[PDB]
Amino acid sequence: FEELKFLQQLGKGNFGSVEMCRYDPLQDNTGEVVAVKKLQHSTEEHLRDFEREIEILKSLQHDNIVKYKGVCNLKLIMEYLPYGSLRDYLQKHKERIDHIKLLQYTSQICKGMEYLGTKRYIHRDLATRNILVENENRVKIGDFGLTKVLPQDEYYKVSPIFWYAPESLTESKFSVASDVWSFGVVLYELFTYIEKSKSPPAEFMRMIGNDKQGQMIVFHLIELLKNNGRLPRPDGCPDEIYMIMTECWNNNVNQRPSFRDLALRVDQIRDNMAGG
Ligand SMILES: CCS(=O)(=O)N1CC(CC#N)(n2cc(-c3nc(Nc4ccc(C(=O)OC(C)(C)C)cc4)nc4[nH]ccc34)cn2)C1
């Protein structure tokens, strides 16, 4: 990929940055526009981590995963998605998005995670902020900066604590079952329509009490999660789908559902409420 005209920035993070660029190979100003992700503090440690991430994305080919384009301090060139993040899209089209459309997005997030498991990859950052919208009918998982290849010899011991599983908060352990936990949180968001007042951090802080800060919030989030304290059922959210959230939020890692089973449940529910 040829050294690209920085049109505008799409996403800015602490160590990462995603901008929209134009290839313009023949300098005809007609080359397709791509999404370029570069590191903020291009260190030696981050460069090594950022190098793996490029290898993981180029190894993934799925309808609900952003298609890698190539490389160009290195730069990661990806597919550009015009509708941006799902939480920006959903908030701007709430009244035009029903539960069936909601379950469509849920179903293809599920299958993308299913495919992810096949390669033995743990995403570790499953949230609506990392879900991009290509058109009004297809969303994709857009970031893999925290993804860790499961070792050859079932978990990876290594932050968005309000999306984390209890074993990740305590033992710093991440697995497919920890991604299942975070998926249930993603399902929670999906049905609150990205209302900030009902966001998981805003909801957990009211249950914990906001006279707490620093790492003492993590202390009380652990004690609350261990005492069967969970995010409430969002209003309008059917009972059957709220149970999927609770099933993902089981303290016993062994009883959390699989991603293949969630995709079939989501599809069955979506078709059942579509045909009456
Ligand atoms: C770790 C921090 S991070 O910096 O590295 N980081 C955040 C991250 C989360 C994820 N995934 N992100 C991805 C994109 C992104 N956006 C797009 N299209 C658009 C199109 C329109 C708009 C827009 O209207 O602007 C507003 C502010 C949304 C209204 C924005 C984006 N296409 C993409 N292709 C690949 C990535 C990507 C932006 N942020 C990756």
How long is the chain?
276
CATH 1.10.510.10 in the chain: give the residue spans: 86-272
Residue 90 tokens, joined: 């959903």
Could you count the other beta carbons within 10 Å of the beta carbon of residue 234? 19
Distance (Å) from CA 60 to ligand 1 centroid: 19
Whether ligand 1 lies within 6 angstroms of the CB of 80 is answered as yes
State the method.
X-ray
- Among 8, 22, 34, 132, the mutation site with the greatest number of ligand 1 atoms within 8 A of its Cβ is 132
Q: For residues 36 and 54, what is the distance between their CA atoms, to the nearest angstrom? A: 12
The neighbouring-strand residues paired with 18 are 11, 37
Q: For residues 88 and 156, what is the distance between their CA atoms, to the nearest angstrom? A: 31
Rounded to the nearest 10 degrees, what angle do helices 200-208 and 176-192 cross at? 100
227 by Cβ neighbours in 10 Å (0-12 / 13-18 / 19+) ranks as exposed
The neighbouring-strand residues paired with 99 are none
Q: Buried b / exposed e across 244-275, counting CB within 10 Å, b at 16+?
A: bbebbbbeebeebbebeebbebbbebbeeeee
**8 Å CB contact between 179 and 113:** yes
Beta-sheet strands, E only, within the chain? 5-12, 16-22, 33-39, 68-71, 76-79, 121-122, 131-135, 138-141, 148-149, 156-157, 173-174
> What atom of ligand 1 comes closest to residue 141's alpha carbon?
11
Q: For residues 80 and 21, what is the distance between their CA atoms, to the nearest angstrom? A: 9
Residue 28 tokens, joined: 């005809």
CATH 3.30.200.20 is right for the domain spanning 5-79: yes
Q: How many helices (H) and strands (E) does the chain have?
A: 9, 11
Q: How far is CA 90 from CA 156, 161, 220, 276, in A?
A: 32, 23, 31, 25
Q: How far is CA 137 from CA 103, 125, 160, in A?
A: 11, 23, 28
Could you count the other beta carbons within 10 Å of the beta carbon of residue 76? 26
DSSP tag of 207:
H
**8 Å CB contact between 33 and 80:** yes
DSSP tag of 143:
-
Could you count the other beta carbons within 10 Å of the beta carbon of residue 149? 14
Distance (Å) from CA 125 to ligand 1 centroid: 15
Q: Buried b / exposed e across 50-66, counting CB within 10 Å, b at 16+?
A: beebbebbeebebebbb
Q: For residues 134 and 108, what is the distance between their CA atoms, to the nearest angstrom? A: 13
CATH 3.30.200.20 in the chain: give the residue spans: 5-79
Architecture of domain 86-272: Orthogonal Bundle (1.10)
Q: For residues 39 and 147, what is the distance between their CA atoms, to the nearest angstrom? A: 16
Active site residues: 125
Q: For residues 246 and 204, what is the distance between their CA atoms, to the nearest angstrom? A: 15
Residue nearest to atom 13 of ligand 1 (CA): 11
| Residue 116 one-letter amino acid | L
Q: For residues 93 and 274, what is the distance between their CA atoms, to the nearest angstrom? A: 20
Reference 224, options 213, 209, 208; nearest CA is 208
**What is the maximal distance between C-alpha atoms in the chain?**
62
First-to-last CA distance in the chain?
A: 51
Residue nearest to atom 9 of ligand 1 (CA): 130
Residue 127 phi, psi (nearest 5): -155, 165
The neighbouring-strand residues paired with 38 are 17
3 state SS of 229: coil
**8 Å CB contact between 79 and 92:** no
